[PDB]
Symmetry: D2
């Protein structure tokens, strides 16, 4: 699924996920969030299962963005964990965790959780 | 916190997290899980906030492992989202999402969630 | 939103959520899962914000099912945490945590996480 | 585990969880949070597995608090999903989801996730 994953994806918020899948299981690219304390592109890296099951299952993958670039620093990082599902309506179905750096006193509220669905259109 | 993060970390399960923090915000290294469908080291990559707040807050970071190596393939990926807290008892406090590749019929049960605390000892 | 919440709801899996919202903030009713180790109705209870904000925000709520009834016992419990959004296309948007009873050795994999959207049709 | 669960529990934040386990699987009581937009006691309800496995596994349970009482209204609800582990050092090990009522534009950041461990001391 190197060819299936590589490209430009869009989620339900209108964020843009630009990724290259390497033969070795690497994910590289950029993320642009339509929401939150974010502007322009941020570096992402991650991993995917480069030899998935042949039993109709999706392809497990994940990636990280740290919300620092040349424009802004939100002192936070999001990880998306999900699976790629190929076919006419290809999708990447994810759940995510967004952790902010906090004081010890605020650590109980450090982490947001949500779900993003990415499509090729 | 490049120097603070770089090194060998251990979680409460006895897993080993070996990481290098790059000046650019990169995380690279290997993960060895003490539990689950796993043996030996797996590649990891991720990101951290390379210019954190100076107000006593932790340093946001995340990383991904796809559970494929030369020995086993669990057709799954874990992402850890958390923060590094420096000092005498340095810690990386994380929450994680483990997604398996599934059929559509099993996708409701694709994702485990948990929490790992990493220490230098 | 007592009247708005009270009734029969259906999620994307075809599960049936039957609830009564009490003037005091109580949620009572039954849940029938279309998937998993489940048959027929299970008791649920929960709580909702009985005096929500008047600024266009949704209404926070949550509920629990323990997966024991007269037919089956899956030794697990799900909690749904979410918000009710009123209007022509009323919705309850949730994230959920499903914890199984485990040995200590399996506790790292005790908890599934997912997201359900409930509608009135 | 009706007798094992019923009583006063305390988490790592110094919150107080007062619960009664019913023969029928009900959980009733009050919660007092040491942190956040909270004062005094709030109603809770939930469910637990009243016929757990006899193979050394914990007892699955969950409960909800809506953060409205006679003093404050945070327009939010937390659900805890976890398991009770009996013995000399009895524990309730939970993960939780805290959903706030939001506008549609803020719904992506509606839900915090965390983990609480409750003990009898």
């Amino acid at each position: 699924d190197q060819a299936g994953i590589t490209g430009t994806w869009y989620n339900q918020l209108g964020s843009t996920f630009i990724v290259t899948a390497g033969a070795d299981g690497a994910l590289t690219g950029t993320y642009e969030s339509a929401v939150g304390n974010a502007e322009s592109r941020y570096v992402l890296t991650g991993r995917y299962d480069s030899a998935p099951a042949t039993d109709g299952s999706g392809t497990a993958l994940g990636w990280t963005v740290a919300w620092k670039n040349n424009y802004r620093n939100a002192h936070s990082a999001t990880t998306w964990s999900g699976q790629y599902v190929g076919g006419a309506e290809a999708r990447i179905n994810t759940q995510w965790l967004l952790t902010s750096g906090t004081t010890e006193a605020n650590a109980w509220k450090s982490t947001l959780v949500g779900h993003d669905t990415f499509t090729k259109v």
